[PDB]
Amino acid sequence: MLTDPIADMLTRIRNATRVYKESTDVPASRFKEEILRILAREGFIKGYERVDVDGKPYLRVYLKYGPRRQGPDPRPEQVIHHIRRISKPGRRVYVGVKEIPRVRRGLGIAILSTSKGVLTDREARKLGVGGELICEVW
Amino acid sequence: TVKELLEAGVHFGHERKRWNPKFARYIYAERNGIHIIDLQKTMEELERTFRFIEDLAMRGGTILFVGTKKQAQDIVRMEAERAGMPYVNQRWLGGMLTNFKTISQRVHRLEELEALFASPEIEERPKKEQVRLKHELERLQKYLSGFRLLKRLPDAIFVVDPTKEAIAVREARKLFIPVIALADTDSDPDLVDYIIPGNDDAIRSIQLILSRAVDLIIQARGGVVEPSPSYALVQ
Amino acid sequence: GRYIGPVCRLCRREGVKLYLKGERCYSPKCAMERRPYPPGQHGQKRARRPSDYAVRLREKQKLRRIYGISERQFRNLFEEASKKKGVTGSVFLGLLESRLDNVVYRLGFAVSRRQARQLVRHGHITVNGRRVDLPSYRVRPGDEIAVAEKSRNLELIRQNLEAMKGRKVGPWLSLDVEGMKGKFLRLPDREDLALPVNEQLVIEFYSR
Amino acid sequence: DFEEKMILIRRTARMQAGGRRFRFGALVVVGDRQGRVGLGFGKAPEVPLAVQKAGYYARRNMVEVPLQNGTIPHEIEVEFGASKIVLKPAAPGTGVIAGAVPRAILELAGVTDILTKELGSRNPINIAYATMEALRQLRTKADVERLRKG
RNA sequence: UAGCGCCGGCCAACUCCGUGCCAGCAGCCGCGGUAAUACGGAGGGCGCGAGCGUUACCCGGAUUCACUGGGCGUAAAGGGCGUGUAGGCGGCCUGGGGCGUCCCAUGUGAAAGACCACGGCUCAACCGUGGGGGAGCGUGGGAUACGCUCAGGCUAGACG
RNA sequence: CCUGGUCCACCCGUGACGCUGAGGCGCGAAAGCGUGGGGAGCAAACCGGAUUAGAUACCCGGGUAGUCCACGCCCUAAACGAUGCGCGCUAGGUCUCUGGGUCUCCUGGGGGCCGAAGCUAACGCGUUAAGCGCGCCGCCUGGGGAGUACGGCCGCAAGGC
Numbered sequence A: 001m002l003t004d005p006i007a008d009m010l011t012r013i014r015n016a017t018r019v020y021k022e023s024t025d026v027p028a029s030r031f032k033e034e035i036l037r038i039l040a041r042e043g044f045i046k047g048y049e050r051v052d053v054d055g056k057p058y059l060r061v062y063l064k065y066g067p068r069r070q071g072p073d074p075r076p077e078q079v080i081h082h083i084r085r086i087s088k089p090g091r092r093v094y095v096g097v098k099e100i101p102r103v104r105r106g107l108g109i110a111i112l113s114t115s116k117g118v119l120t121d122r123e124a125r126k127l128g129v130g131g132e133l134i135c136e137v138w
Numbered sequence B: 001t002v003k004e005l006l007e008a009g010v011h012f013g014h015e016r017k018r019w020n021p022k023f024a025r026y027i028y029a030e031r032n033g034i035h036i037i038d039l040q041k042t043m044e045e046l047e048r049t050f051r052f053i054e055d056l057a058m059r060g061g062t063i064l065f066v067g068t069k070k071q072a073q074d075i076v077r078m079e080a081e082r083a084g085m086p087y088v089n090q091r092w093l094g095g096m097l098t099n100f101k102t103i104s105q106r107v108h109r110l111e112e113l114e115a116l117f118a119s120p121e122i123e124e125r126p127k128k129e130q131v132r133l134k135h136e137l138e139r140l141q142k143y144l145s146g147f148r149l150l151k152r153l154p155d156a157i158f159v160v161d162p163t164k165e166a167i168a169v170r171e172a173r174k175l176f177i178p179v180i181a182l183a184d185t186d187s188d189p190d191l192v193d194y195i196i197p198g199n200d201d202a203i204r205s206i207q208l209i210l211s212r213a214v215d216l217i218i219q220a221r222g223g224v225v226e227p228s229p230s231y232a233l234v235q
Numbered sequence C: 001g002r003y004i005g006p007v008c009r010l011c012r013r014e015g016v017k018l019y020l021k022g023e024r025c026y027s028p029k030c031a032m033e034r035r036p037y038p039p040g041q042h043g044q045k046r047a048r049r050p051s052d053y054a055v056r057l058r059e060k061q062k063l064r065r066i067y068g069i070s071e072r073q074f075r076n077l078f079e080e081a082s083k084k085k086g087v088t089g090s091v092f093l094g095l096l097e098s099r100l101d102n103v104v105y106r107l108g109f110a111v112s113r114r115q116a117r118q119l120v121r122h123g124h125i126t127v128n129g130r131r132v133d134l135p136s137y138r139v140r141p142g143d144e145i146a147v148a149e150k151s152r153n154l155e156l157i158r159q160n161l162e163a164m165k166g167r168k169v170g171p172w173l174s175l176d177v178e179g180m181k182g183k184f185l186r187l188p189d190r191e192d193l194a195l196p197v198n199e200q201l202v203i204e205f206y207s208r
Numbered sequence D: 001d002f003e004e005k006m007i008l009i010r011r012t013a014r015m016q017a018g019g020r021r022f023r024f025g026a027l028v029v030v031g032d033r034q035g036r037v038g039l040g041f042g043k044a045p046e047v048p049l050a051v052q053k054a055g056y057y058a059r060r061n062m063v064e065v066p067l068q069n070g071t072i073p074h075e076i077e078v079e080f081g082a083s084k085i086v087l088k089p090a091a092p093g094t095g096v097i098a099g100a101v102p103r104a105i106l107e108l109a110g111v112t113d114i115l116t117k118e119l120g121s122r123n124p125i126n127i128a129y130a131t132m133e134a135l136r137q138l139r140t141k142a143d144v145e146r147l148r149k150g
Numbered sequence E: 001u002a003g004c005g006c007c008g009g010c011c012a013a014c015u016c017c018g019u020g021c022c023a024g025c026a027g028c029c030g031c032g033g034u035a036a037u038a039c040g041g042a043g044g045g046c047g048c049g050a051g052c053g054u055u056a057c058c059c060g061g062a063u064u065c066a067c068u069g070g071g072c073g074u075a076a077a078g079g080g081c082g083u084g085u086a087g088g089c090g091g092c093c094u095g096g097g098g099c100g101u102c103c104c105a106u107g108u109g110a111a112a113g114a115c116c117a118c119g120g121c122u123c124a125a126c127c128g129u130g131g132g133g134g135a136g137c138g139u140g141g142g143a144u145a146c147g148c149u150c151a152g153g154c155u156a157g158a159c160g
Numbered sequence F: 001c002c003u004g005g006u007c008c009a010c011c012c013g014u015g016a017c018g019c020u021g022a023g024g025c026g027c028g029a030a031a032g033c034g035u036g037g038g039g040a041g042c043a044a045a046c047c048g049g050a051u052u053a054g055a056u057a058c059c060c061g062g063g064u065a066g067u068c069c070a071c072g073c074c075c076u077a078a079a080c081g082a083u084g085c086g087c088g089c090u091a092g093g094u095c096u097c098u099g100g101g102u103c104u105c106c107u108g109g110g111g112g113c114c115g116a117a118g119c120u121a122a123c124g125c126g127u128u129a130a131g132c133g134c135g136c137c138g139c140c141u142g143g144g145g146a147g148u149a150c151g152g153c154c155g156c157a158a159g160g161c
C-alpha cells in the first residue's frame, strides 16, 4: 500500500510537471484536497477538481507552467520548481509558531497542519499557531 | 491563401512505428497501420505560421529554405529561387549558421573563382591549375548555390524534414533563429517554433505547402507573381 | 613597540605616499617622490602578480601603518567594530579616527601622528580640562581637546598652531586657534576620510 | 566597460610518440558589476591565447543577476556534478564571504554582501559552473508573481 | 632595552658565496649526487614586537559518524536465500476522548558569567548600576488539522 | 504416484486482515568429515615417461581418496544483476515465453535489446531504474597489519561466525 499518501501526491505532481503533463490524477482524500486548495490559492496549479476513475474517487490536478522559451530547450519554466515533503511517517516534524520557517525569503511557501486548519506559513504566523510541518514549495 | 479540402496527400503520415509520441496531439487517428494527421489542427497551426511568415516577409526578412530529402530536393531550388530567398539543397554543412563567417569565406572564394573564369587569366599557369580550379568551382556551385545569397544570418529558416535536417534546426535554436518546418509523425514538435503538421514524404504535399508559402511571401512584398512552375516536377 | 624605524620606506612598500613624517612628505624629499619603487635590493625588479592574500594583507598593512598602531590594538579595534551595530568598515574607520593621538594630529597641534603620540604621552594635551597622556584614549563627541596651559609657551606648539591660522579642519572637528583648543563634534563619515584604502579588503583579510 | 579576471590557469598534457605535448586551459570571468556576469574556459597551445579566447567565450555566455541592495534575492543550493554551491543572502556591511572562485564570479556580478559554502567536490571548474547556474536560477518576487498570475 | 620567527608551493618575503644524495632541512608535497630562491653563512626582504618560536592538548576546517548534513552496480559498503518473533511503519469516510502536537496565562529558570546601555579607576584590562533576554519543567484554561486511542462504516491494499 | 509456487478470466466472498523484519528457526553449489554400500569413466595425492638450465608444472602412460547411493555432519563462494524487500508515479520502439479478448489489433504476467525525461565521477542505468518518492532491515567510514590475535559460541575434525 501507500505508506505516505501526501508524499505520494506531491511526488505525482512533481513527476507529472517534469514531463509537462496537462493534468494528473491522485487518489482522493479530504486532507489531500485541503492541501490542493492552498496550492491553488497560492497559484502553483491552475486548480483541481474531483473526478471518478473507474468507480473510485480521484482528484485531477491541473498543472501550470511558464511561457515557451528561446534558444535550445524551449521547454517552459516550471511554476513549481521545488515541492518537498518534510514531516514523514517515522520521522514527524512539529514546529511552534516561533519556529515556522520562511521559504526562499518569502518567495516560497510552507504548508502547515494546525488545529486552526491547514495553513501556509504566512497564514499560520498571522493566526499565530504552529503545527505539523507538511511540506515546502517554491 | 486557400488550402482547406484542397489538401490531398498531406493527412497521410508515417507508419504505426517510427513516430514521436509528442506528435500525438496533431494526430487524428490510426488507419491501416498508419498515423493520419489531424485535418483541422493542420490549418489551425497553418494560420499562425503563415501569419508569422507574412509579417516577417513584409518586414523584408530573409528566409533560408532547407531540405535534402530528395523528394523535396528539386522543389526547394525553384520555390526558394522565387523571391529573394536563399536555400540549402545538396547537403547541410556543419556550421553554416554557427560557423557562418568561416563558411562564408567559401562563398568569397566562389565568386573569386567565377571572377577568375571571367577574366583572361583562365589560361594563365599550367593546365594543372585549370583542371583543379574548375572542379573546385564545380563543387562550390554544387553546394553553396542557394547559400551564396546570404550576406548575413537569416531572420528565420524553413525546413522540410526537421528530423533529417535536425542539425540545421539545432543551430537555428542555438542562434535564436526562429524555426519554421513541415513536421511529420516522426518529428519532435517542441523544437519547431512554427509548425506545419503534414506529410514530408509525398512530393504533392511539399509542392503545395512550399508553393503557397512563397506565394504568400511575394504577396506580402507585392507584385503577385504568376503560379509556380513546380507542377511539372510531379513527374 | 609602535614601530620606531624608518618610515618613508613604508611610503615605498605600500606604493602609495603616506604621511608619517608630517612635513617633508610634502617636500620633494619624500623619497616616494624620487623612488616610487619598493625598498630593498629587489625593489626595481618586475613584480609578479600578487595573490589575493597578498593584496588584502598589503591593504590592511597600509591602513595600520597609517595610524602607526600595533597589530594587537588594530585587531582588537576591528573585532570590536565587528561586534557593533552598523557597517563594520565605516565603524572601524570611525573608531580608528577617534584615537586621541589621531585627533591631536587632525586638529593640527602636531604635524605628524607620531609627534602627536609624543605630545600626548608627555601630557602636553588635555581632554575637557584634565590631562590625558594615553594616545589610545577614545574621544567622544562633545569632548574638548585642548593644549596644556603650561605647554602653550613651547616653541613646537607655537610653530604648529601659527601654521594652522587660515587652515581648515575636518567637518567633524572644530578648532579655536587662539585659545589653542578644539572640539570633536561627531564621528567621521566614510565620505569625510581621504584615506587611500579599501576597507572591504581589510574586512576580507580578517574574514580569512 | 567590462572588468575581467581569470580564475585559474593550468597546463594539461597529452601523449604522443616520443613525448608529452602540453596545452593550456584558462578560466575567465567577465562582469560590469552592474549585475551582468560571464564565465568561460579557453584552451590553447600557449597561455595568452588561452586567456584571450577564454575572455571571448565568457562574453559569449552571460548571466543576468537580479541584485537587491547589493545582495542576492534568496538562498540557492546548486549541484554541478559532485560540486555543490550554497549561496545565502546577507545584510549590508557583511562583505563577500566565499572561496576564490565564487568570490571572483560574485564580485564581478556586483555583489557586496553574500554568504557562501562550497560542498562536495571543490574542483574549481565545476564550482565555477555551479555558481553560474546558481546565479542563473535566481528569481525575484516580480518574476515569481509573474509566473503565478494565471 | 630590541628581539624572535620566516622568505620552493600551500604562505607575505630573493640574491651572492660555501657545501656536492655529504653535511643537513622537512607540518604535507619535497630539497641536496658542481653553478641549491628549500642545507650552512652573508646582504636584503616579509611578519610580529617585550616578546617571538617550538612541543603537547581541545574545537575548527571535517558535509571525514552526515539531526541540520553522507553513502553501498564497478571507489569501503546489500546479509547466500527464505520463514517469521519483538519492534518500526499504516488505504478511504464519520463520530467520541485530547495522549502526542499547537496556543494564551502563570510559577520556576539563584549570584557570577554571556548581550546592551550608562557610569568609576587619566584609557583599557578590571569593576559598579540598570535593562533585555532565555531552552527545559510545574500549574490553570483553550484548539482538534495531523499522529495516537475507542466505537461505527467502505472496498481501491491484502487474502479467499 | 505424492507435493510447492505461480499466471489469466469472472467481479462472487471476507473487510485493512497490510509492508518490513533485530534475535530465533529452516534451506544452503563444490570441496571436506562420519557409518555403511558402490566403483564403469574421470581423477588431488602418488608412481613413471618427456620438456627444461632446473620442471617438486604445463604435454604423455598409470593411479588412491574422491566423484555415485543412503543416513548424519560441515555453512563456505566471483553464494553475482558484484544492484535487500514492498508499494506508488514518470515517452516510446523492437524481439521473445505464457494467458485472455470484438484475434490487423487490444489487454495482463515474465524474459531481452535500443532509447523520452531524469540520474551518474564516468562507464552506464533508463516501466525488469542505477529516475521521482515513502516505509522497514543489513552494511560502509583511508591502505598494510588482518579476516590475523584474544575471548565467546558452533564443529568429530578440517574449520566457521
Ligand SMILES: NC[C@@H]1O[C@H](O[C@H]2[C@@H](O)[C@H](O[C@@H]3[C@@H](O)[C@H](N)C[C@H](N)[C@H]3O[C@H]3O[C@H](CO)[C@@H](O)[C@H](O)[C@H]3N)O[C@@H]2CO)[C@H](N)[C@@H](O)[C@@H]1O
Binding pocket: C079, C080, C083, E127, E128
Ligand atoms: N566583568 C564585569 C561586568 O562588566 C559588564 O560589562 C561587560 C561588557 O559591557 C563589556 O564589553 C566590552 C565593552 O568595551 C563593550 N561593551 C564591547 C567590547 N567588545 C568589550 O570589550 C572586551 O570584552 C571582554 C572583556 O570584558 C573581552 O571579550 C575583550 O577584552 C573585549 N572584547 O565587557 C564586560 C564584561 O567583561 C558590566 N559592567 C557588569 O556586569 C560588570 O561590571
Ligand SMILES: NC[C@@H]1O[C@H](O[C@H]2[C@@H](O)[C@H](O[C@@H]3[C@@H](O)[C@H](N)C[C@H](N)[C@H]3O[C@H]3O[C@H](CO)[C@@H](O)[C@H](O)[C@H]3N)O[C@@H]2CO)[C@H](N)[C@@H](O)[C@@H]1O
Binding pocket: E072, F084
Ligand atoms: N545506493 C543506496 C540505495 O538506497 C536506496 O534508498 C535510498 C533513497 O531511496 C533515499 O533518498 C535519499 C534521502 O533519504 C536523503 N534525505 C538524501 C539523499 N540524497 C537521497 O538520495 C536520493 O536522491 C539523490 C538526488 O539528490 C539521488 O542521486 C539518489 O540516487 C537518491 N537515492 O535514500 C536512500 C539511501 O541512499 C535503497 N533502499 C538501498 O537499497 C540502496 O542501497
Ligand SMILES: [K+]
Binding pocket: D079
Ligand atoms: K541534480
Ligand SMILES: [K+]
Binding pocket: D039, D061, D129, D132, D133
Ligand atoms: K554556464
Ligand SMILES: [K+]
Binding pocket: E022, E023
Ligand atoms: K661535509
Ligand SMILES: [K+]
Binding pocket: none
Ligand atoms: K642541479
Ligand SMILES: [K+]
Binding pocket: none
Ligand atoms: K638559507
Ligand SMILES: [K+]
Binding pocket: none
Ligand atoms: K580536528
Ligand SMILES: [K+]
Binding pocket: none
Ligand atoms: K558478500
Ligand SMILES: [K+]
Binding pocket: none
Ligand atoms: K558562546
Ligand SMILES: [K+]
Binding pocket: none
Ligand atoms: K583427509
Ligand SMILES: [K+]
Binding pocket: F103
Ligand atoms: K490467441
Ligand SMILES: [K+]
Binding pocket: none
Ligand atoms: K552522459
Ligand SMILES: [K+]
Binding pocket: none
Ligand atoms: K554493456
Ligand SMILES: [K+]
Binding pocket: none
Ligand atoms: K551467515
Ligand SMILES: [Mg+2]
Binding pocket: A084, A085
Ligand atoms: Mg525528501
